[PDB]
């Protein structure tokens, strides 16, 4: 029972940006208020929690390009 | 029982942007209010929670292009 | 029982943008209010929750182009 | 019982935009109010919940073009 | 039962940015307030918690490009 | 007496040629004979002059397209 | 006396040629003979002059298209 | 008397050629003979002059496209 | 009397050629003969002059495209 | 009398050539003969002169593209 698996994907991809000018961004929100009331917190196993947050994010990348690749080869018998 | 699997996808793709000018963005919201009341929190196993949030995000990438790729080869017997 | 599988998709695709000028975006909402009342939270197994949120997002990519690809080869016997 | 499967789709597709000018966007809503009352929350297994939200999104991509591709080859015996 | 697995994906990909000018970013939010009340915190197993946060982030990378790659070969018998 | 002049023309033009083959050009004129006997020519100021010309031109562009664009804003007083 | 002038023409034009083959051009004139006997020519100011010309032109563009665009804003007083 | 002049034209133009083959050009003129007997030529000021010319030009560009763009803002008083 | 002049043109232009092969050019003119007998030529000021020319030019660019752009802001008084 | 002049043009231009092969050029003219008998030539001021020229040029660029850009801000008084 000969089994041959040849896995050769070829990737010449290209994720490209060209920006001549990227300027004059103003991020001026008014002040916010967050009020969270609780009594008991009983987190267990795998919990990713986030309680009472106030984020002001100015994210200005020159490219900000992404390439996400994933190769899997699974072999049972 | 000879089994031959040849997996060779060829990818010459291209995700491209060209912006001459990217400017004059104003993000000026009024102030917000968030009020969350609770008593018990009993998270368990896999819980991704987010309680009482106030996000102001200015995301201005020059390209912001994405390419997401996924290859899987699964082989049982 | 010879089995031959040849998997060679060829991809010369192209996701492209050209913008001469991208400017003068104003994101000025009025202030919002969110009020969530509860008593018990009992999340379990896989729960992705989001309670009491107030998002102001200005997302201005120069391209913002996406390409999502997915290849699967499954082989049982 | 010889089985030959040749899977070679060829893709020269093209998702393209050209915008000369993309400007003068104003997103100025009035302030909103969200009030959610509950007592018990008992989420289990796979629940994607979202309670009490107020989103203001200004999404102005220069292209915003998408290409979604999906290849599957399934082989039982 | 001869088993041959040849895993040679070839990657000539390219995640590229070109920005002529990236300037004049102003991140001036109003002051925020966060108030979180609780009595008991009983975290266990794997809990990633974050309570009472106020983040002001100005993230201005010249490229900010990402490439995420993942190769897996799994072999049972 | 406020004066504002905004000058931002946008040009996404394209002057393009495609040729599959550009071959087999032969330029074999017979021998020319030019004899000029010029005396007392008295050119003055701005003068362009051709005297006794034998021009054998073979001009075979694969394209030869052209685009002349002229923009002019004039603010006198 | 406020004066505002906004000048933003947008041009997404395209001057394009396609040719499958551009071949087999032969330019074989017989021998020309030019004899000019010029005396006392007295050109002045702005003058363009051709005297005694024998022009054998073969002009075979695969395209030869053209586009002349003229824009003019004139604000006198 | 405030005067504001903003001059930001955007040019994403493209002058492009593609040729598959550009071959087999032969330029074999016969021998020319030029005899100029010039006396007392008296050129003055700005003069461009050609006397006794035998030009055998073979001009075979794979492209030959061109784009002349002229911008001019004039603010007199 | 405030005067503001902003001069920021953006140029993302591209003058490109592609050729697959550029071969087999032959430039074999016959022998030319130039005899100039010039006396008393009296050129003055700005003069460009060609007397007794036998030019055998073979000009075969794989491209030959060109782009002339002229920008001019003039603020007199 | 405040005067502000901002001069920041952005140039992301590209003058590019690609050739697959550039071969087999032969430049075999016959022997030329130039005989110039010049007396009393009296050039003055700014003069460019060619007398008795036999130019055999073979010009085969794989590209040959060009881009002339001129910017000029002039603030007189």
mmCIF file of N, CA and C in Angstrom, chain I residues 5-59:
data_model
loop_
_atom_site.group_PDB
_atom_site.id
_atom_site.type_symbol
_atom_site.label_atom_id
_atom_site.label_comp_id
_atom_site.label_asym_id
_atom_site.label_seq_id
_atom_site.Cartn_x
_atom_site.Cartn_y
_atom_site.Cartn_z
ATOM 1 N N UNK I 5 0.482 80.305 0.425
ATOM 2 C CA UNK I 5 0.560 79.518 -0.794
ATOM 3 C C UNK I 5 0.983 78.119 -0.405
ATOM 4 N N UNK I 6 0.143 77.143 -0.704
ATOM 5 C CA UNK I 6 0.449 75.745 -0.457
ATOM 6 C C UNK I 6 0.616 75.079 -1.809
ATOM 7 N N UNK I 7 1.763 74.445 -2.013
ATOM 8 C CA UNK I 7 2.133 73.833 -3.282
ATOM 9 C C UNK I 7 2.523 72.401 -2.965
ATOM 10 N N UNK I 8 1.578 71.475 -3.060
ATOM 11 C CA UNK I 8 1.875 70.056 -2.871
ATOM 12 C C UNK I 8 1.196 69.165 -3.913
ATOM 13 N N UNK I 9 1.639 69.237 -5.167
ATOM 14 C CA UNK I 9 1.173 68.263 -6.152
ATOM 15 C C UNK I 9 1.672 66.873 -5.822
ATOM 16 N N UNK I 10 0.863 65.885 -6.160
ATOM 17 C CA UNK I 10 1.174 64.494 -5.885
ATOM 18 C C UNK I 10 1.265 63.768 -7.214
ATOM 19 N N UNK I 11 2.358 63.044 -7.417
ATOM 20 C CA UNK I 11 2.609 62.361 -8.677
ATOM 21 C C UNK I 11 2.927 60.904 -8.389
ATOM 22 N N UNK I 12 2.019 60.016 -8.765
ATOM 23 C CA UNK I 12 2.225 58.578 -8.688
ATOM 24 C C UNK I 12 2.303 57.985 -10.085
ATOM 25 N N UNK I 13 2.891 58.735 -11.012
ATOM 26 C CA UNK I 13 2.903 58.360 -12.413
ATOM 27 C C UNK I 13 3.816 57.164 -12.650
ATOM 28 N N UNK I 14 3.818 56.699 -13.891
ATOM 29 C CA UNK I 14 4.528 55.479 -14.250
ATOM 30 C C UNK I 14 4.715 55.478 -15.757
ATOM 31 N N UNK I 15 5.965 55.485 -16.209
ATOM 32 C CA UNK I 15 6.295 55.366 -17.626
ATOM 33 C C UNK I 15 7.038 54.047 -17.775
ATOM 34 N N UNK I 16 6.398 53.063 -18.386
ATOM 35 C CA UNK I 16 6.871 51.691 -18.336
ATOM 36 C C UNK I 16 6.867 51.091 -19.732
ATOM 37 N N UNK I 17 7.821 50.210 -19.988
ATOM 38 C CA UNK I 17 7.881 49.431 -21.206
ATOM 39 C C UNK I 17 8.092 47.967 -20.870
ATOM 40 N N UNK I 18 7.505 47.098 -21.679
ATOM 41 C CA UNK I 18 7.838 45.683 -21.649
ATOM 42 C C UNK I 18 8.024 45.208 -23.076
ATOM 43 N N UNK I 19 9.120 44.507 -23.318
ATOM 44 C CA UNK I 19 9.405 43.907 -24.611
ATOM 45 C C UNK I 19 9.823 42.468 -24.384
ATOM 46 N N UNK I 20 9.371 41.577 -25.253
ATOM 47 C CA UNK I 20 9.713 40.176 -25.109
ATOM 48 C C UNK I 20 11.047 39.847 -25.735
ATOM 49 N N UNK I 21 11.332 40.483 -26.863
ATOM 50 C CA UNK I 21 12.596 40.325 -27.559
ATOM 51 C C UNK I 21 12.817 41.568 -28.397
ATOM 52 N N UNK I 22 14.063 42.003 -28.483
ATOM 53 C CA UNK I 22 14.426 43.173 -29.282
ATOM 54 C C UNK I 22 15.721 42.827 -30.006
ATOM 55 N N UNK I 23 15.582 42.265 -31.206
ATOM 56 C CA UNK I 23 16.695 41.623 -31.864
ATOM 57 C C UNK I 23 16.736 41.920 -33.344
ATOM 58 N N UNK I 24 17.819 41.463 -33.972
ATOM 59 C CA UNK I 24 17.932 41.344 -35.426
ATOM 60 C C UNK I 24 17.823 42.705 -36.121
ATOM 61 N N UNK I 25 18.478 43.717 -35.566
ATOM 62 C CA UNK I 25 18.541 45.039 -36.183
ATOM 63 C C UNK I 25 19.813 45.115 -37.008
ATOM 64 N N UNK I 26 19.688 45.551 -38.257
ATOM 65 C CA UNK I 26 20.828 45.717 -39.142
ATOM 66 C C UNK I 26 20.828 47.132 -39.684
ATOM 67 N N UNK I 27 21.966 47.797 -39.581
ATOM 68 C CA UNK I 27 22.126 49.184 -39.989
ATOM 69 C C UNK I 27 23.329 49.209 -40.917
ATOM 70 N N UNK I 28 23.088 48.999 -42.208
ATOM 71 C CA UNK I 28 24.153 48.934 -43.206
ATOM 72 C C UNK I 28 23.908 49.938 -44.320
ATOM 73 N N UNK I 29 24.116 51.223 -44.064
ATOM 74 C CA UNK I 29 24.037 52.194 -45.150
ATOM 75 C C UNK I 29 25.220 52.089 -46.090
ATOM 76 N N UNK I 30 25.017 52.603 -47.295
ATOM 77 C CA UNK I 30 26.129 52.826 -48.184
ATOM 78 C C UNK I 30 26.968 54.001 -47.730
ATOM 79 N N UNK I 31 28.165 54.098 -48.303
ATOM 80 C CA UNK I 31 29.074 55.154 -47.901
ATOM 81 C C UNK I 31 28.594 56.515 -48.369
ATOM 82 N N UNK I 32 28.494 57.443 -47.424
ATOM 83 C CA UNK I 32 28.118 58.815 -47.712
ATOM 84 C C UNK I 32 29.349 59.629 -48.075
ATOM 85 N N UNK I 33 29.110 60.781 -48.695
ATOM 86 C CA UNK I 33 30.172 61.710 -49.078
ATOM 87 C C UNK I 33 29.661 63.119 -48.815
ATOM 88 N N UNK I 34 30.322 63.822 -47.908
ATOM 89 C CA UNK I 34 29.986 65.208 -47.606
ATOM 90 C C UNK I 34 31.168 66.088 -47.979
ATOM 91 N N UNK I 35 30.909 67.127 -48.769
ATOM 92 C CA UNK I 35 31.921 68.115 -49.134
ATOM 93 C C UNK I 35 31.328 69.499 -48.904
ATOM 94 N N UNK I 36 31.861 70.224 -47.932
ATOM 95 C CA UNK I 36 31.370 71.551 -47.581
ATOM 96 C C UNK I 36 32.448 72.561 -47.941
ATOM 97 N N UNK I 37 32.089 73.589 -48.707
ATOM 98 C CA UNK I 37 33.059 74.676 -49.015
ATOM 99 C C UNK I 37 32.472 75.957 -48.428
ATOM 100 N N UNK I 38 32.733 76.239 -47.148
ATOM 101 C CA UNK I 38 32.075 77.397 -46.486
ATOM 102 C C UNK I 38 33.052 78.541 -46.232
ATOM 103 N N UNK I 39 32.691 79.754 -46.657
ATOM 104 C CA UNK I 39 33.547 80.941 -46.417
ATOM 105 C C UNK I 39 32.686 82.110 -45.937
ATOM 106 N N UNK I 40 33.176 82.901 -44.978
ATOM 107 C CA UNK I 40 32.481 84.141 -44.526
ATOM 108 C C UNK I 40 31.190 83.859 -43.754
ATOM 109 N N UNK I 41 30.993 82.645 -43.243
ATOM 110 C CA UNK I 41 29.787 82.435 -42.403
ATOM 111 C C UNK I 41 29.956 83.376 -41.214
ATOM 112 N N UNK I 42 28.921 84.126 -40.847
ATOM 113 C CA UNK I 42 29.104 85.141 -39.780
ATOM 114 C C UNK I 42 27.961 85.011 -38.783
ATOM 115 N N UNK I 43 27.985 83.964 -37.967
ATOM 116 C CA UNK I 43 26.817 83.764 -37.067
ATOM 117 C C UNK I 43 26.949 84.678 -35.847
ATOM 118 N N UNK I 44 25.825 85.098 -35.258
ATOM 119 C CA UNK I 44 25.876 86.070 -34.131
ATOM 120 C C UNK I 44 24.778 85.752 -33.109
ATOM 121 N N UNK I 45 24.939 86.205 -31.861
ATOM 122 C CA UNK I 45 23.913 86.003 -30.799
ATOM 123 C C UNK I 45 23.624 84.511 -30.611
ATOM 124 N N UNK I 46 22.344 84.134 -30.580
ATOM 125 C CA UNK I 46 21.987 82.713 -30.331
ATOM 126 C C UNK I 46 21.651 82.056 -31.672
ATOM 127 N N UNK I 47 22.511 81.146 -32.140
ATOM 128 C CA UNK I 47 22.289 80.485 -33.459
ATOM 129 C C UNK I 47 22.591 78.989 -33.358
ATOM 130 N N UNK I 48 21.691 78.133 -33.845
ATOM 131 C CA UNK I 48 21.996 76.682 -33.923
ATOM 132 C C UNK I 48 22.039 76.376 -35.415
ATOM 133 N N UNK I 49 23.132 75.802 -35.912
ATOM 134 C CA UNK I 49 23.243 75.630 -37.381
ATOM 135 C C UNK I 49 23.795 74.263 -37.770
ATOM 136 N N UNK I 50 23.219 73.651 -38.803
ATOM 137 C CA UNK I 50 23.744 72.403 -39.337
ATOM 138 C C UNK I 50 23.965 72.601 -40.825
ATOM 139 N N UNK I 51 25.199 72.404 -41.275
ATOM 140 C CA UNK I 51 25.563 72.596 -42.673
ATOM 141 C C UNK I 51 26.272 71.341 -43.153
ATOM 142 N N UNK I 52 25.746 70.728 -44.209
ATOM 143 C CA UNK I 52 26.361 69.545 -44.767
ATOM 144 C C UNK I 52 26.261 68.345 -43.854
ATOM 145 N N UNK I 53 25.048 67.858 -43.634
ATOM 146 C CA UNK I 53 24.809 66.754 -42.724
ATOM 147 C C UNK I 53 24.290 65.549 -43.493
ATOM 148 N N UNK I 54 24.785 64.375 -43.121
ATOM 149 C CA UNK I 54 24.303 63.114 -43.677
ATOM 150 C C UNK I 54 24.145 62.185 -42.477
ATOM 151 N N UNK I 55 22.942 62.162 -41.915
ATOM 152 C CA UNK I 55 22.664 61.437 -40.685
ATOM 153 C C UNK I 55 21.869 60.182 -40.996
ATOM 154 N N UNK I 56 22.416 59.029 -40.626
ATOM 155 C CA UNK I 56 21.769 57.737 -40.845
ATOM 156 C C UNK I 56 21.495 57.140 -39.471
ATOM 157 N N UNK I 57 20.287 57.353 -38.969
ATOM 158 C CA UNK I 57 19.925 56.992 -37.606
ATOM 159 C C UNK I 57 18.989 55.797 -37.638
ATOM 160 N N UNK I 58 19.298 54.785 -36.843
ATOM 161 C CA UNK I 58 18.382 53.688 -36.570
ATOM 162 C C UNK I 58 18.066 53.709 -35.085
ATOM 163 N N UNK I 59 16.817 53.998 -34.754
ATOM 164 C CA UNK I 59 16.397 54.221 -33.378
ATOM 165 C C UNK I 59 15.288 53.229 -33.063
#
